[PDB]
Each structure stands twice: as structure tokens, then as C-alpha cells.
Amino acid sequence: VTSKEWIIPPRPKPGRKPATDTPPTKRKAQNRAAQRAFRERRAARVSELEDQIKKIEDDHEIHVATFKEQIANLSREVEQCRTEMGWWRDRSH
Amino acid sequence: PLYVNAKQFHRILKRRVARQKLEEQLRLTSKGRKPYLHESRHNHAMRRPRGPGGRFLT
């Protein structure tokens, strides 16, 4: 069973068609540029926050995994030393 | 063994809850189906001009 690599095209974003025209004043042009930026900058700090969440979520999963491995390494060391000691104990008498 | 598919199991139990609740709201007493649905088609099925073998025609 084989298929080609098919990618789902994103559904067309809603809203008001972005103004095709250039404004004929540099003073209202720099306004447009700075306002348009404001709408992206705000919309970005909520978009970038899912990355902050998923960074912590992943960076904390790796540190958890290290401990859960490290305590199991130190748990088997107890279970090793107990039986090893038990041998020396019995072989002493 | 009797261990079922874990991917579905969680959703299978969720459905049993929703599937039971609906059956009561539908006011349906019987578990089995009805012999028919529409009386107009049932009545049209008797009026129905037939042949010797029960096949319909006009």
C-alpha cells in the first residue's frame, strides 16, 4: 500500500480584503505601516505564547525523563547492593 | 486474550453513555425496528396495481 505525500491546503482566511492601493500621503502611509504592524505584533504575542507553553512542556518532559531514569539507576543499585551484601554475609559464616 | 483496542476503548465507553441517554429521549419502547415508516407509501403499496407474482406495474 503506497500513496503520494498529499498536503491539506489551509482553508481561505476570513476578513476584509487588504487594501490594494498605496495611500497618497507619507504621513498616512507611515500610519498604515505602523498600525498594520500593531495588528501583527498583538496577534503574534498570543501566537508566540503557545510556543512558550510547548517549549516548557517539552523541556520539562526531558528533565522528568532524566530523573525517572536516574532514580531507577539508583533503585537497582540498592537492589544490587542488598543481594551482593547477603552473599558476603552468608559466605562469612 | 480478551483485552480490546485501547485507542477506541475510551471512546467506546463514552458512546455507550450518549447512546443510552438518546434512546430514552426518543420515547422508543421497542429495541427492534418497525415493519414500515410512512403510511402514505404503505397505503400506496396496497392500492398498488400488481400482477400474478406480486410484481407492480401501470
Binding site: V1, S3, W6 | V4, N5, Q8, R11, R15
Partner: protein, 117 residues
């Protein structure tokens, strides 16, 4: 990823199913799809979905996906069930023939309430 195709299926019964899914995939990649022409009516698929009072608004897409998805579902099960009938020397597809096919794969474990053991 494609493990559900020949799940609980061996002999020549494994090839016929894989051959179907390939035919399905090839005609999904190839022919121009009319998203109005459907073997199962779109309107009712939406009703089956909106029968769950947890679901509120449904995109036009989902019914259209289910229409095809159900067509391919029915067709594969009927074929799976049809093998069981020919193995037991029958021309009539019985309820038991379906039941028998549903127990072959753990994919159908959601239907156990519809057809118990």
C-alpha cells in the same frame, strides 16, 4: 499507517482488500471528484452527526468526507463478510457473515454493542 488493510486477513483474502484500497487511493489521486454526486445523501450524514446534542455547528466538508469514507467503509466490510459466506459455501450474505468479519480486526471493536459475541 496501512496495517488496518489486511488485519486478521491471510490467503488470497489479504490481496483482494489491498487491491481495493489501492484502486480507492488511485481514483482519489486521479479522477475529477463531483462533491454533489454521492451514493449516501449528504443531508442525512449531517443529521446522524447532529443526533449527538454535544455537536452544534458542522462544516460542509465533514459530511462530504463521511459520504466517501462511509462508501469505502460499507464496501470493504461487505467484501470481508462475502469471503466468510463463500468459505461456508453460501450465495446469500447473512448477518453472521458480517459479525464474523467484525471479529477478525480490532478496528471494528466499536461495533461490538451493535453486534455482540
Amino acid at each position: 499507517t496501512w496495517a488496518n488493510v489486511n488485519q486478521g486477513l491471510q490467503g488470497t483474502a489479504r490481496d483482494i482488500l489491498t487491491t481495493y484500497w489501492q484502486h480507492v487511493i488511485n481514483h482519489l489521486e486521479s479522477d475529477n471528484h463531483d462533491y454533489k454526486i454521492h451514493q449516501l445523501p449528504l443531508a442525512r450524514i449531517k443529521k446522524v452527526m447532529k443526533a449527538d446534542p454535544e455537536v452544534k455547528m458542522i462544516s460542509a466538508e465533514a459530511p462530504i468526507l463521511f459520504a466517501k469514507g462511509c462508501d469505502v467503509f460499507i464496501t470493504e466490510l461487505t467484501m470481508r463478510a462475502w469471503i466468510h459466506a463463500e468459505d461456508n459455501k453460501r450465495r446469500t450474505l447473512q448477518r453472521s457473515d458480517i459479525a464474523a468479519a467484525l471479529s477478525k480486526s480490532d478496528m471494528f471493536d466499536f461495533l461490538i454493542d451493535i453486534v455482540p459475541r
